[PDB]
Paper text:
SEN has been proposed to contribute to the virulence of GAS by serving as a plasmin(ogen) receptor.
To provide the foundation for understanding the structural basis of the virulence function of GAS SEN, we determined its crystal structure at 2.9-Å resolution. Plasminogen BS1 is located at the C-terminus, while BS2 is located on the catalytic loop L2. The initial rate of phosphoenolpyruvate formation was calculated to be 131 nmol/min/μg of recombinant protein.
Numbering used by the authors: 0 to 40, 45 to 433
Write the structure that this text describes.
Amino acid sequence: HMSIITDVYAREVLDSRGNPTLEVEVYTESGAFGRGMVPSGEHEAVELRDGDKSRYLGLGTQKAVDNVNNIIAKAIIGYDVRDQQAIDRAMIALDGTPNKGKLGANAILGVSIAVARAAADYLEVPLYTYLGGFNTKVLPTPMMNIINGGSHSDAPIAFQEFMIMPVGAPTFKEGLRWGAEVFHALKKILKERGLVTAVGDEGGFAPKFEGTEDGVETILKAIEAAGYEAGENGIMIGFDCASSEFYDKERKVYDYTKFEGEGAAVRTSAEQVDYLEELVNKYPIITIEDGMDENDWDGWKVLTERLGKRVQLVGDDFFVTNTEYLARGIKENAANSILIKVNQIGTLTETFEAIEMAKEAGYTAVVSHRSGETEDSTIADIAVATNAGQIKTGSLSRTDRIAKYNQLLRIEDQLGEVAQYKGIKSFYNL
């Protein structure tokens, strides 16, 4: 039979940081072919690294490759390419450990994506429709990393990302246009101001700003210089605080002096909500990723209680694309959104279960990328697959980001008049 998987093959390659990762290629009997590349950035499914400090600083992925070829290959070769779920469970079972540590979630995912991309090819249909069935129409309102703080910046800013969103644009094409044009308008401002216009891991700037206020304030300046409004009818802001980064576990506080230098405001759970609340009043923020630590459940509860109805609140690391942690989130009214990083969980099925569960709680599934990305564009299709309405794939520079933006332009076009773009209406959690 022609649908049947006859080859599965991995090799080591580079992600967009200059670090190894892997691709898996799957052939069917028929000639059909798919290529699954894997990205890379605690409760998060393990990615296998060689540890050999004399190869790529021990970030080699030969371990992973050798598991795809010598173990997963033999097990999987034989299945029908379309048994997307039979296969993902095979690998999971085969692996046997809860956080995919035996074979590694890079190995597993790789295969799993390859097989889908192969099956979509086999049936001679786009990836989003294979994945999603026939009712895939919605193009994601994207949230575009434009300024960086935290580890990435040297400026006195703790929040890791500052993003934007063309919620007010009619089509995703225009939305991207909008988004780009501001990025160039900002880039200009940053030159006139004498700050660094080189870009970090997600294609954003990370300039030496005065602090968090100057940070937002200029993103707004940019928006206006481009000639868009700053609201529901224009462009709006978001954060990834990555607060788990500046949380002191023993003092159980949000230590801003780590990133904003001595004489900076150390905050408790309650104060932290109050700051974020301030920010939201002051500004047209619409989303806030990791407002809190990944083990600060009480905090999360309160945060979401306060802004839960004004502002979309996304648990990134607080859920790790993982049903177990998310169900608890739902139960305890812990967020109203979730960041869906496919490699964080390891297979597409588990990824879809996660995206599914979240919808039925009135939680938005934000499909996201990882810092270490690839020429792959699978996640773009995943946001259309599920009509998720949202996507975080980075800034408007570096093909690691723009591959997806293009990929989505492709999907917009291929969908002709069928395509929708929900802008602000994608926030069914509000």
